Design an enzyme around this catalytic site. Sequence first.
Site, PDB file in Angstrom:
ATOM      1  N   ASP A 112       0.986  -1.459  -0.332  1.00  0.00           N
ATOM      2  CA  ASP A 112      -0.122  -0.101  -0.460  1.00  0.00           C
ATOM      3  C   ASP A 112       0.352   1.260  -0.189  1.00  0.00           C
ATOM      4  O   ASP A 112       1.688   1.269   0.079  1.00  0.00           O
ATOM      5  CB  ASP A 112      -0.525  -0.243   1.493  1.00  0.00           C
ATOM      6  CG  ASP A 112      -1.879   0.920   1.515  1.00  0.00           C
ATOM      7  OD1 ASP A 112      -1.380   1.997   1.408  1.00  0.00           O
ATOM      8  OD2 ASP A 112      -3.387   0.338   0.778  1.00  0.00           O
ATOM      9  N   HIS A 114       0.177   3.551   1.457  1.00  0.00           N
ATOM     10  CA  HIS A 114       0.609   4.239   3.126  1.00  0.00           C
ATOM     11  C   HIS A 114       1.185   4.437   4.451  1.00  0.00           C
ATOM     12  O   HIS A 114       1.934   2.560   4.299  1.00  0.00           O
ATOM     13  CB  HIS A 114      -0.979   4.022   3.281  1.00  0.00           C
ATOM     14  CG  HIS A 114      -2.089   5.248   2.977  1.00  0.00           C
ATOM     15  ND1 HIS A 114      -2.655   4.387   1.709  1.00  0.00           N
ATOM     16  CD2 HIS A 114      -2.018   6.720   2.025  1.00  0.00           C
ATOM     17  CE1 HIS A 114      -3.437   5.676   1.680  1.00  0.00           C
ATOM     18  NE2 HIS A 114      -2.570   7.178   1.282  1.00  0.00           N
ATOM     19  N   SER A 196      -5.220  11.263   1.159  1.00  0.00           N
ATOM     20  CA  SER A 196      -5.564  10.541   2.200  1.00  0.00           C
ATOM     21  C   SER A 196      -4.903   9.561   3.126  1.00  0.00           C
ATOM     22  O   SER A 196      -4.875   8.546   4.468  1.00  0.00           O
ATOM     23  CB  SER A 196      -5.653   9.080   1.096  1.00  0.00           C
ATOM     24  OG  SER A 196      -4.318   8.901   0.953  1.00  0.00           O
TER      25      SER A 196
END
Length: 278
Positions: A112, A114, A196
């Site tokens: 991912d 993040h 995000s």
Amino acid sequence: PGVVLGRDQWLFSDEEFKPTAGAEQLMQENLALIRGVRDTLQQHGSQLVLAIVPAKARVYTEYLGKERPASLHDDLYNQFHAQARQANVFAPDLMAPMEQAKARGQVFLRTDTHWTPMGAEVAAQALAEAVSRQSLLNGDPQAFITEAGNTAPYKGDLTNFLPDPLFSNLLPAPDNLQKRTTRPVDQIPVALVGTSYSANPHWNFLGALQQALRSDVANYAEDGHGPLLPMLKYLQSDAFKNAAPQVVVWEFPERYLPMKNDLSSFDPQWIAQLKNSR
């Protein structure tokens, strides 16, 4: 928008790799806008704390595969910090503490884009140290408690850019994700703006900030529009115009600096004001 394969079933955003045509002028343009935002906030009595998130590809270079980022990305984090300093923008270093924290566990997810909840918490703590050091907040401290819940598999945002369901068996193993929630012990002095990284509850960056700052924090981050558009939206909002916070934390991942922002929906006169604030 794509994905780059690393070693050991790691995935990276190709936005941390790809060259951008006219990247130099795009960076100039974005920095002039960041500086205008800083000046606008200050004029309303808000202190800007810019939170430059290092690229996952920079923090986890050891999981780079065959493909390496283009030269634009070699020293982008450093140059972002240097230009922010030139602009009198306060931008605490998040790379050194996140790097330190790799010994404890993953500070970014494997599949991912993040940070992990632990990674975001390290960033929040670094930002809170800097805020305390500069005395940016006054007011009575408010205490928060963060509780760690269960851990469960998590399908990373990059896996969806992989090539086709006949090849689902080739997908990397899901990450594991620990739930973490923050609550108070029981006008907001701090606002959070970003991407995000900040909008998604899974990384608990808002809660980590509340706890580290010992302060309530309002979240105006948004998912999917980059770091600038939510900041411009915030500056035009009733929330800001009617109750400017003492501190605005602006989360701005490094890979967005040489990327184009669609400003077509904003008044050119206002864009002009931001760029010409000096």
